[PDB]
Amino acid sequence: MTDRYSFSLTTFSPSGKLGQIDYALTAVKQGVTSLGIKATNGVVIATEKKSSSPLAMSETLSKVSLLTPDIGAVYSGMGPDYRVLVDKSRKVAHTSYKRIYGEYPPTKLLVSEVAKIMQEATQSGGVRPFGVSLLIAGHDEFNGFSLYQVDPSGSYFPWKATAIGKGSVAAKTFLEKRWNDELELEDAIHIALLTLKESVEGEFNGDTIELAIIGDENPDLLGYTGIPTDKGPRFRKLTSQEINDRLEAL
Amino acid sequence: MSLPGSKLEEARRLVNEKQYNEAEQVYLSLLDKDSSQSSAAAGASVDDKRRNEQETSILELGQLYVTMGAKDKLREFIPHSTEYMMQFAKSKTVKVLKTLIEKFEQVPDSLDDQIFVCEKSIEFAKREKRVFLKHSLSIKLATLHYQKKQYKDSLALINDLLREFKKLDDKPSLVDVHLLESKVYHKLRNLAKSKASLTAARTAANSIYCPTQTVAELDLMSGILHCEDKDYKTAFSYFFESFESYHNLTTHNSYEKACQVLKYMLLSKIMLNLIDDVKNILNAKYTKETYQSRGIDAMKAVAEAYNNRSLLDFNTALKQYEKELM
Amino acid sequence: GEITFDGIGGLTEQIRELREVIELPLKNPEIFQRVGIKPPKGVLLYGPPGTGKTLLAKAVAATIGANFIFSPASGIVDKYIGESARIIREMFAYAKEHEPCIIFMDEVDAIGGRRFSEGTSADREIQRTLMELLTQMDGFDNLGQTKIIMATNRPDTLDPALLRPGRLDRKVEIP
Amino acid sequence: AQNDCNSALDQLLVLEKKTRQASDLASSKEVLAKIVDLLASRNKWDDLNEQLTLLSKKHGQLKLSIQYMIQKVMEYLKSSKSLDLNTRISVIETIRVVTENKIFVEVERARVTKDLVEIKKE
Amino acid sequence: RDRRERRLIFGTIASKMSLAPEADLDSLIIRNDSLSGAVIAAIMQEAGLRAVRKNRYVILQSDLEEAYATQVKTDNTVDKFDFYK
Amino acid sequence: AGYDRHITIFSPEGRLYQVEYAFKATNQTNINSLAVRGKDCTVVISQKKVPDKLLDPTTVSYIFCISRTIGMVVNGPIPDARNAALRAKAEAAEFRYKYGYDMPCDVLAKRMANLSQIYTQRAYMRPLGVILTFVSVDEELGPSIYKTDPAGYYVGYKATATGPKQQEITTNLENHFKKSKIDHINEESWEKVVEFAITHMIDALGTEFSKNDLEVGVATKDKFFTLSAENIEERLVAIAEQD
Amino acid sequence: ADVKGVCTEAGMYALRERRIHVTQEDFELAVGKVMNKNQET
């Protein structure tokens, strides 16, 4: 009685592929257009906000989560897989670093920690592997601003701009052409709305874009108005009005 | 005071109380002197916050100046004050540069004056990093030539701009030029050339997201070619599409657009011999609006002059209604 | 029909849907014509034949005084040149003369399959039949005083052509 | 005076229970004849008409009971003419039991329309 | 069919049947995203036909809406996909 | 492994067969629900029927009171509904000891979603079929409606519906809210809030229902209560008092 | 096979503009059309 399932559910096929990773990727291709840009004077990430219903809050909805204070992530794939994964990433990041080295994990180090979760899950049976791909966009004061891709298997590679979801390749073409480093964060926000207007047609607004930047400070993001002791967050998610203001700014 | 916002209010009061020329003296003095917040950029003033307000003074003068023949002074001022904007951000230069030629063309009255400003904006823009949209401004010059009655000269420029566009991703501009390229062709007597060009504007329009109004405007041209190349039925059907959509826009349709579709709609029926249906448009007021003008009265008069088999009645409308109608 | 429509009431829901698609255009073309949207095409009854589907089909015919045309779908399967073309043609021509009419197609899988497995043995006779029905429909001849009603237990051996609007548009289910 | 009015009102609350709104008791003109004729007696016919019209918007022992009573009162309104003539209009727009939408069938239904329409033409 | 394309199909079938200043296209553009030209024409045509069987001569934006909502589903399926909601 | 619907693992297409079938035929159990927000209340109306005269309909429950203040409306069957109830109840209670505070709708929703997801990846468990709508009048947000659905997806609402009269309910509330420029109506007494609910209900599902055919659950500040049978008729007669 | 497609796509351009030959121009535009397809999202 009870489970006995310990046989791996991810297995090799005659070609050298892994059935479960192939499947999972189809889901990711069909998922919501997300991109990431390093502006060099920041990092701007944008993703599609969506609504389920007009009578539905989209405050609760999670399309951009802060993994650690200076770092945000966005994705294309399977929403439920994303939500749990964010949780295990937040937990280990807090317990194992935030009073051990006395600060957040470096971006590359955090990409490896995610990578490991996904790989445990691919090796081991009882459970199928995560079906997701992430774009982890970040700042760490020992590597600047970074952009990574995290694949479903947990393969990762460095990027300085990319897009995943539906309609990626052409989105990368517009981004490649418009930005080539040394660019204001504001300007990268403008370029990003332009790339996505061409990418999404039928109805387009800044109330269907959810935009976050890592690329600012306020005293409010030290979390106190007194005498500094540390630097604190640089994650800031914008409200819908601010985004419409940048849509009005040519 | 001497700060920018106070000097906006005081100069504005100078227009009302006296004249634009008096206000202009104040505006010039706000550049020349009067210490203002943040870094200088005139040797005494801003030209950032100073420039957003500068859009507003150029505008205030600019409508009157082309009509007045005070044009020359309007013509000088913008070129001198462009080099201010260069000393601020990329975005600031982009926003101001593009506006100015459009501001003038909301109330045009000196085609010449408008042409002259625009050519310096095209040289000036090159000094930043912008060479994408200098052709987009070359459409603005082209519309002015069209109006001068220089179709031949416009033809020679317009094509070259079309070629640039499709490998710089200036795809929203492409719809604009294709429609204009058609108007040029139509006048030169190349009825064939106009349809083909228009079909390209149509492919281009559906490539991208765009306003409701743009889409309907090409369809207005489509129905206009379909009266000159026959098939009054097909002309009917687009003008129908334009008019339904403007009904749902209600009274938020712009004035020229709504009026021109309606002038055309009534006409297409008269040629088609659906005489009864001009009288139905006339009674209807969601499909005619509140509008009465000489045009609407002429169409009613001809369509009726048509039904009775009456030549006297035709001549009568032709003549009273003539300036607007013809 | 040989059984009444008001007498089989308690089958009420099905009765009303069937009245509103069939009776009103047949008696009064004039209303459908004024709006400028065509009269209804073809109707499907789907769900059990053994619950008294069959009773309903006869019953609708009884109130209109329409000519009830019962068809064995297999019998439309003669193995000779064109006998099979000829029957579809006769059935339609006679419907127009003897209009109003119900043309009732008993278990549609044999004149409106999907293919056995994508393969063929005899499932090309099925295609020959099926193109003829789609052709009359698509045609210049229009369904409005000739009504065709298809019946089958399952919708999972109807052709995709039929399931597409404009060869059936009304789909009544037995609740 | 009050007592006879009460026997109409209390007997109305008995009748509301009585009526038929599910498979309960039973749908009778017998009760409604007691209310409408003896309220006409307590009061007058015009007064009866306004109060009755509001009561009809709720139950009514199946609406044919109400439709029959509406025709009698109507004949009195017409007989007197003036503002009661106006009152016929008001009553017929308020409730539909003589221009009935629960069923389309009846002779009383038609009759009550023909009299209103004739006065309007005239 | 892109957004400018669907828009035309609602208009063209809408000409053929009863219409009034209520026959709001703006509503419709949100309601339909990229279905074939066959499909858009099929639906717009059916809805005028269905309203008239419900014993309505008039067609409104309200009328198209009530016909559509009936045809599209009879079972309840929660949002769209499992990929995004 | 095995197959994609003999055990829970990805489909060929990257879909999950089990979550989509969990959406469909768990609301067709003769259940239809709506929830709307008051001014200082939250109202739920939900269908709830008994097919025997021999089935005591008190024990019949599909609005549950999770705590003294928290309610959870389940759409879907009683075997599933009690697996989710046991979890909900436990979570509520645990929260109360450990964090010292009453359980918000949103926190409960989020926790249950993540848990269902884990059971979705498992090859020896199922996702539950149930759709869970968690209601109270929080003192940290006002009247609240938060709904989880079975895929590990969950999201907050201001007004929601489930069962295939979703479109009807939505449209009536949407037009109404666009006109009034608010998504909450203003009225103090619970009574007037239930009347507002019924108005939109009756129009939308096109029918009215008996006392024992309804079950109405009301959230108030620091209480959740279900309306007795007479109390649910009182309201249906009270609109008809107006008529 | 694409080199054969380029000529046939170039030809529809020539045909529309009512020429009795194809030109170099048509061929560049035709190459642009094929490249567009290869890049698919």
UniProtKB/Swiss-Prot annotation, chain B:
> N-acetylserine-modified residues are where?
S2
Give the CC-aspect GO terms. proteasome complex; proteasome regulatory particle, lid subcomplex; proteasome storage granule
Q: Recount the PTM note.
A: N-acetylated by NAT1.
Question: Which keywords label this protein?
Answer: Acetylation, Proteasome
Q: Which GO terms describe its molecular function?
A: structural molecule activity
Q: What's this protein's function?
A: Component of the lid subcomplex of the 26S proteasome, a multiprotein complex involved in the ATP-dependent degradation of ubiquitinated proteins. In the complex, RPN6 is required for proteasome assembly.
One further remark on this entry is: Present with 16800 molecules/cell in log phase SD medium.
Question: Record's family?
Answer: Belongs to the proteasome subunit S9 family.
Question: What name does this protein carry?
Answer: 26S proteasome regulatory subunit RPN6
Q: Which organism is it from?
A: Saccharomyces cerevisiae (strain ATCC 204508 / S288c)
Measured against the full-length protein, the chain present covers 1 to 326 of 434
Curated annotation (Swiss-Prot), chain C:
**What post-translational events are described?**
N-acetylated by NAT1.
**Residue positions binding ATP:** G47, P48, P49, G50, T51, G52, K53, T54
Function per UniProt: The 26S proteasome is involved in the ATP-dependent degradation of ubiquitinated proteins. The regulatory (or ATPase) complex confers ATP dependency and substrate specificity to the 26S complex.
Q: Which family does it belong to?
A: Belongs to the AAA ATPase family.
Protein name, please? 26S proteasome subunit RPT4
Look up and give the organism this protein is from: Saccharomyces cerevisiae (strain ATCC 204508 / S288c)
Q: Which residues of the full protein are shown?
A: 176 to 350 of 437
From Swiss-Prot, chain E:
Signal sequence coordinates: none
Covered residues of the complete protein?
A: 344 to 428 of 428
Superkingdom of origin organism: Eukaryota
Q: What does this protein do?
A: The 26S proteasome is involved in the ATP-dependent degradation of ubiquitinated proteins. The regulatory (or ATPase) complex confers ATP dependency and substrate specificity to the 26S complex.
Q: Which compartments does it reside in?
A: Cytoplasm; Nucleus
Q: What is this protein called?
A: 26S proteasome regulatory subunit 6B homolog
Q: What does the entry report about post-translational modification of this chain?
A: N-acetylated by NAT3.
Family of this protein = Belongs to the AAA ATPase family.
From Swiss-Prot, chain G:
Its taxonomic path starts at: Eukaryota, Fungi, Dikarya, Ascomycota, Saccharomycotina
Q: What does the subunit section of this Swiss-Prot or TrEMBL entry state? A: May form a homodimer or a heterodimer with a related family member. Interacts with OLA1, TMA17, and UBR1.
Per its UniProt entry, which superkingdom is the organism in? Eukaryota
- Similarity section: Belongs to the AAA ATPase family.
Question: What additional remark is attached to this entry?
Answer: Present with 4700 molecules/cell in log phase SD medium.
Covered part of the full sequence, start to end and full length, is 356 to 396 of 405
Q: What is this protein called?
A: 26S proteasome regulatory subunit 8 homolog
Briefly state the protein's biological role.
Answer: The 26S proteasome is involved in the ATP-dependent degradation of ubiquitinated proteins. The regulatory (or ATPase) complex confers ATP dependency and substrate specificity to the 26S complex.
Summarize the PTM comment. N-acetylated by NAT1.
Location within or outside the cell:
Cytoplasm; Nucleus
